[PDB]
């Protein structure tokens, strides 16, 4: 699953467990009603759910999923990635980083579908090289579903990083399908144009604490057209990157959408 | 026991050294200091092509990367196959002589020489500009050969290079730095950035009278 | 302060000719070039108040902004709408007021590159 | 392999203006200041401004005789091709040209000169108001010698699509030292520098000849070049 | 039919006086305040090929005007079969005449026949009609014996290229407005007994390209005639 | 104040102590061309000598320049007015040792183009 990748070959990691499962009977029917509810096969209903949605709804939202915002092209283009269990409260899936990054959130795509906005997950991905060893390959994502499980409202993500901490509101709206494609779609039919030009970019939004780096931010959004391309749509195509500069969180999730590109290619 | 070369280089035209004021893509810069600077590489790059036209292309060569090179090159340069050493490297270098470019007043250390695009149905002019380091810039220069034990792949194991093996390596960088100042060092192509010229070639040791029998391959640039 | 944040506006109070605007900036292009250069002095050199030798180098770039305004139509208003005349009166204690006049100046031509097409 | 450079002397018959937007003026204003040496401000003729004069010619010269038209710096025939250059066939060609400064500046002190260039007060008498709107456009004095120095890399054709590294035969090398000359003899019949067809940048040459610096050539064909060359 | 550049020969030679003029040179020795556009390093006297054209640019756009009447009011508002020798902004075209500089050529034979200083101070006055008052000057011009050689030349067809004719009538244009040149004046000071030329020896030749047979004796027909 | 470096703040103010006429200049750009495309010639050469005193052979290149200072006073009345108070010949007087004062004036005399296109349109 690096062997094939057109773009970077990185092996990424997915772990992800649903929160808060000790929980899900002792205190998770007796809020509503006074907890007449509470008996045998009420209980025993969700644990024969969880035994197909972990364990084989996952075989349909990997063989033939419908997210496709980084790969694209085929609707039923198979994941390329590997579970390795599917079973209760811990799902564990490595392959490919490309794959498995829209998957990460399009099976919980399939999650807030059944509790409908009850119950919270918070998951981890990480891209790795092939080689590497297994005992930092949980360790460190090991973070990913470590740092936002410890999200205030615990309905969150956490991308390569720490510091990237996202809600899974504010990941596949904020993120993909507003700052990443806004990105890669200017230049979409110009699709091999310069990120040797995007890796300038995110210099700037670690020095973003800086005055005139306000000044470098449109400085070099102007040095991208001219007489050799199509300039009918440029004037908004750095104004909001432009108005994304200011604010103290617009940016952090563009950086994952700068990441997003230059790791495609 | 480093057959240190040192010398200086310095051109006569401009010199446009990529890198990748609103100049639209200005020269290599030191950037602690953003001075001009000649970059490692592409000394290398430019002798390892045009070294691969002259010990090459005599002998029917069609040389498709520095991979299938003969063996005269790779013994200097390295490659992934064989790989004998790496054996040639130079030293990186910047501008040198900066204060007394200034004293003797060329103050910008780049022109912007401006340029022009005639298309051939209009006739109407399209102006562009490249930088230039300055023609009176003269670098310090150094690059490092050594005693060279071999390190074989090959089963002729620890097979040290005899003294015929240097004389046939300095003939080449005779034939390499001497070669290059009848074509480019940077941009410009075909077009007059990029005649150098080389100024107080030396080699030092960092047996004896090899030693004067190699500097004679060094006055002949 | 403001000197970073004045750019934003005072490029849109340039009075373009014909609707684009008069100054383009190759106009500045003997005087960018030659405060770049000026920046990068400026900086490396250690000590506050300025050397002896980049104490006149900026006499030049003085005198050079008085000439040029003067001598073209665009930048006869560029230099008191920015105000940079004003500013390089007194310039010769140190590079705090320096390093901000070359990062105002800075600004300027990042906000001119944006505030109109301006191709290659 | 060889290095066949092609060394001479320039030199202005006319005045000669070259001069490229505005590099540095620091005294003497005027319209146009001709492009110089920037540590010493010596005139030069840098090298696109003849790559291009002699390369627009010649696509002149194998159109309208085959009566093609050739619109793109990148579709002219091969002969050009192979000696300036291409995008598509002959990525880099064999040609490489320089920049010459100014050689003769103590004989053009000797022989009484002051400034090294001169200003020509033009004119432009308009036909409404009948009245007249000044110029100062200034010239290179006519009678300086720059340098030249052309040098010629040996036919070696690898970067091509199939015909791999196939040296062609000695004829060619006699036909890529013919359009030289002749490129270098169009060029001597016409302007050089800006303000042509107005009485400018004529130039004029000598000691046209050939040698190889670097490499193995025969002296049956080193002749057959140079008789070639200094010829025209 | 393919390519040529026609080169013109010919020696153009002041009859009159002739001062076309420089403004501020650097000649500075008096009242050569009002100088002839001289050679900077020799010093002799020469003549741009800016006059030459912006002579018969201008007296021959109202001599092809001028009958057509319209007046042509600015050097783009001429007719093409001026401009396409001349050059315009209007079709960007490069000209098609390069008219070349010229300088003192014999300089030799002037000091044969004993002229001395090779520019001779033509003095001049002012009367007013109340005062009669003679307010003098010192106007400067060349010997009124000095030849100048003389050197343009022509390009062919190139764009989808001008027919044989086109060669013809536009070569046999350049004799029709050169033969009004030598009747009138050219240098500065006009109308006044000053700037009148006198041409010689106008032939053509194919000095490069291959220029055709029939097409060559009719450039050398009117050229060589006036 | 010393002169010496007010000499290129002194360019803004005796700018104006030439008197205009009309309200429109009298010394305009086009009257001065043979001591700017003159005086190239020698800012050209001063900076390349590396020694710090002048050789006899540029020596008289700043005679004739001197000359030429002294007769377009003679010869024209806006640069008459132009020279005695700026005092141009008092520098070019005892210039001869060394490129001290010389280099003063190959930078003085830039500094008095550039203030008098700024002081007028210099329109196109």
């Given at each position: 699953y690096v062997?094939?990748?057109?773009?970077?070959?990185?092996?990424?990691?997915?772990?992800?467990?649903?929160?808060?499962?000790?929980?899900?009977?002792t205190?998770?029917?007796?809020?509503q009603?006074?907890?007449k509810f509470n008996?045998?096969?009420?209980t025993?209903?969700?644990?024969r759910?969880?035994?197909?949605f972990?364990?084989?709804?996952?075989?349909?939202?990997?063989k033939?999923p419908?997210?496709?915002?980084?790969?694209?092209?085929?609707?039923e283009?198979?994941?390329?990635?590997?579970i390795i269990?599917?079973?209760?409260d811990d799902?564990?899936?490595?392959?490919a980083?490309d794959?498995?990054?829209?998957?990460?959130?399009e099976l919980?795509e399939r999650?807030?579908?059944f509790?409908?906005?009850?119950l919270?997950v918070?998951?981890g991905?990480?891209?790795?090289?092939?080689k590497?060893?297994?005992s930092v390959?949980?360790?460190?994502?090991?973070?990913?579903?470590?740092?936002?499980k410890?999200?205030?409202?615990?309905?969150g993500?956490?991308?390569f990083?720490?510091?990237?901490?996202f809600?899974?509101?504010?990941?596949l709206?904020?993120?993909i399908?507003?700052?990443?494609?806004?990105?890669?779609?200017?230049?979409?039919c110009?699709?091999?144009?310069?990120?040797?030009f995007?890796y300038?970019?995110?210099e700037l939004l670690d020095?973003?604490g800086?005055?005139?780096?306000?000044?470098?931010?449109?400085?070099?959004?102007?040095?991208?057209?001219g007489?050799?391309?199509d300039?009918?749509?440029?004037?908004?195509?750095?104004?909001?990157?432009?108005?994304?500069?200011?604010d103290?969180?617009d940016?952090?999730?563009?950086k994952?959408?700068?990441?997003?590109?230059?790791?495609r290619? | 026991?480093?057959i240190?070369?040192?010398?200086?280089?310095?051109?006569?035209?401009?010199?446009?050294?990529?890198a990748?004021?609103?100049?639209?893509?200005?020269?290599v810069?030191?950037?602690?200091?953003?001075?001009?600077?000649?970059?490692g590489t592409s000394l290398?790059?430019?002798?390892?092509?045009?070294?691969s036209?002259?010990y090459?292309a005599?002998?029917?060569?069609?040389?498709?990367?520095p991979?299938?090179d003969p063996?005269?090159?790779?013994?200097?340069?390295?490659?992934?196959?064989?790989?004998?050493?790496?054996?040639?490297?130079?030293?990186?270098?910047?501008?040198?002589?900066?204060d007394d470019?200034?004293?003797?007043?060329a103050?910008?250390?780049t022109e912007?020489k401006?340029?022009?695009?005639?298309?051939?149905?209009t006739?109407k002019?399209?102006?562009?500009?490249m930088?230039?380091?300055?023609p009176?810039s003269?670098?310090?220069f150094?690059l490092?050969?050594?005693?060279s034990?071999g390190?074989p792949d090959e089963?002729?194991k620890?097979?040290?290079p005899?003294?015929?093996?240097?004389?046939?390596d300095?003939?080449?960088?005779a034939r390499?730095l001497?070669?290059?100042?009848?074509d480019y060092?940077?941009?410009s192509?075909?077009?007059?950035?990029?005649?150098?010229?080389?100024?107080?070639?030396?080699?030092?040791?960092?047996?004896?009278?090899?030693?004067?029998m190699?500097?004679?391959?060094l006055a002949a640039? | 302060?403001?000197?970073?944040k004045?750019?934003?506006?005072?490029?849109?109070g340039?009075?373009?000719?014909?609707g684009?605007?008069?100054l383009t900036?190759?106009?500045?292009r003997?005087?960018?070039?030659?405060?770049?250069?000026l920046?990068?002095?400026?900086?490396?050199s250690s000590?506050?108040?300025?050397?002896?030798?980049?104490?006149?180098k900026?006499?030049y770039?003085?005198?050079?902004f008085?000439?040029?305004?003067?001598?073209?139509?665009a930048?006869?208003?560029?230099?008191?709408?920015?105000?940079?005349?004003?500013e390089l009166?007194?310039?010769?204690?140190?590079?705090?007021r320096?390093?901000?006049?070359?990062?105002?100046?800075?600004?300027?031509v990042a906000?001119?590159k944006?505030l109109?097409?301006?191709?290659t």
């Amino acid at each position: 699953y690096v062997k094939r990748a057109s773009g970077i070959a990185r092996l990424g990691v997915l772990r992800l467990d649903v929160d808060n499962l000790g929980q899900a009977f002792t205190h998770g029917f007796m809020k509503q009603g006074n907890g007449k509810f509470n008996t045998i096969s009420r209980t025993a209903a969700f644990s024969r759910m969880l035994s197909l949605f972990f364990r084989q709804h996952i075989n349909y939202v990997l063989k033939h999923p419908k997210l496709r915002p980084l790969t694209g092209d085929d609707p039923e283009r198979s994941r390329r990635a590997t579970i390795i269990y599917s079973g209760g409260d811990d799902v564990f899936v490595v392959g490919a980083w490309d794959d498995v990054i829209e998957f990460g959130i399009e099976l919980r795509e399939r999650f807030h579908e059944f509790t409908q906005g009850k119950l919270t997950v918070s998951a981890g991905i990480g891209m790795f090289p092939d080689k590497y060893p297994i005992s930092v390959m949980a360790r460190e994502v090991g973070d990913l579903e470590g740092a936002a499980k410890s999200l205030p409202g615990k309905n969150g993500v956490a991308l390569f990083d720490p510091e990237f901490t996202f809600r899974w509101d504010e990941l596949l709206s904020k993120v993909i399908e507003e700052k990443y494609r806004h990105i890669a779609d200017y230049f979409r039919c110009n699709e091999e144009r310069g990120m040797a030009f995007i890796y300038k970019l995110l210099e700037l939004l670690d020095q973003r604490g800086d005055r005139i780096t306000e000044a470098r931010w449109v400085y070099f959004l102007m040095r991208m057209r001219g007489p050799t391309d199509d300039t009918t749509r440029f004037q908004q195509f750095a104004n909001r990157l432009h108005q994304w500069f200011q604010d103290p969180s617009d940016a952090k999730q563009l950086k994952t959408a700068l990441h997003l590109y230059i790791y495609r290619n | 026991a480093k057959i240190e070369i040192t010398g200086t280089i310095t051109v006569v035209t401009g010199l446009h050294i990529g890198a990748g004021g609103a100049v639209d893509k200005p020269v290599v810069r030191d950037p602690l200091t953003k001075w001009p600077m000649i970059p490692g590489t592409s000394l290398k790059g430019k002798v390892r092509t045009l070294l691969s036209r002259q010990y090459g292309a005599d002998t029917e060569t069609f040389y498709r990367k520095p991979n299938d090179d003969p063996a005269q090159i790779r013994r200097l340069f390295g490659d992934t196959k064989e790989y004998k050493t790496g054996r040639l490297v130079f030293r990186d270098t910047k501008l040198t002589n900066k204060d007394d470019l200034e004293a003797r007043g060329a103050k910008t250390l780049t022109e912007v020489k401006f340029e022009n695009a005639i298309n051939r149905v209009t006739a109407k002019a399209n102006p562009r500009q490249m930088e230039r380091v300055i023609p009176g810039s003269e670098f310090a220069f150094s690059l490092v050969y050594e005693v060279s034990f071999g390190t074989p792949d090959e089963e002729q194991k620890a097979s040290l290079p005899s003294s015929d093996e240097i004389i046939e390596d300095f003939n080449a960088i005779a034939r390499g730095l001497k070669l290059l100042e009848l074509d480019y060092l940077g941009g410009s192509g075909t077009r007059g950035y990029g005649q150098v010229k080389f100024s107080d070639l030396k080699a030092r040791a960092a047996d004896r009278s090899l030693l004067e029998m190699l500097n004679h391959e060094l006055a002949a640039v | 302060d403001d000197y970073v944040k004045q750019a934003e506006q005072v490029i849109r109070g340039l009075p373009k000719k014909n609707g684009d605007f008069e100054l383009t900036t190759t106009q500045l292009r003997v005087l960018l070039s030659l405060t770049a250069q000026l920046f990068d002095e400026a900086q490396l050199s250690s000590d506050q108040n300025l050397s002896p030798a980049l104490r006149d180098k900026v006499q030049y770039l003085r005198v050079r902004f008085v000439y040029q305004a003067g001598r073209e139509k665009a930048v006869r208003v560029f230099v008191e709408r920015a105000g940079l005349l004003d500013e390089l009166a007194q310039i010769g204690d140190s590079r705090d007021r320096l390093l901000k006049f070359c990062h105002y100046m800075e600004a300027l031509v990042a906000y001119k590159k944006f505030l109109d097409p301006k191709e290659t």
